Design a protein around this nucleic acid. Sequence first.
RNA 1: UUACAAUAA
Length: 229
Amino acid sequence: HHHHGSRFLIRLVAFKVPYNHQYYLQGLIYNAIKSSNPKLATYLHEVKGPKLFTYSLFMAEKREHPYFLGYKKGFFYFSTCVPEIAEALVNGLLMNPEVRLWDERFYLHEIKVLREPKKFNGSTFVTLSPIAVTVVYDVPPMEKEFYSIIKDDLQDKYVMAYGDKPPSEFEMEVLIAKPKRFRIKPGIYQTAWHLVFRAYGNDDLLKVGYEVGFGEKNSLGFGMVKVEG
RNA sequence: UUACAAUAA
């Protein structure tokens, strides 16, 4: 135990934000992990494969679209099942910034520690960060196997976290599905999916996807989802 | 805490 898990909402303080901005969010996250735990930080890069943390997009208190607008504060979410990944993103964001992203200045306001709904099976999930699943293009939800991949990754992420035989009951049904393409530097096409869906299965199974993510790029800001209730 | 993204390989 182990199994308790963690989720964070961080809040910063008229400003601007881009799209395709999740490589720059890769910056503020590792910066504060090195600034706390320098061995943990370097480790994660070369140490490779799906990491046990994920984080949301950078949203605002409002969305405006002529980059785009900005207003009263702004924020994002972070979830990981590895206690130190979080302790080093809480500690490093604390004794530090002063945060400045791209070049926009900002000042740390609060870090609100959310809760884990113990409700998972059947609950509705909406993507906080889009979803990518890649194979050799990026398979969309109309694809029969988008589901075998997304499931499997979670079964592994499961034992990766639980050190135990993976739970085998997972289905997901998708209501709203939105396409999009991102620039991960310099030269790549990641076709992700903004999603709303119902997912039933082993409770703990989906607990994981909740925390670490759904799909591949969890360390780049894909695959983080929220519960509706 | 927002079913909240402009671009389309």
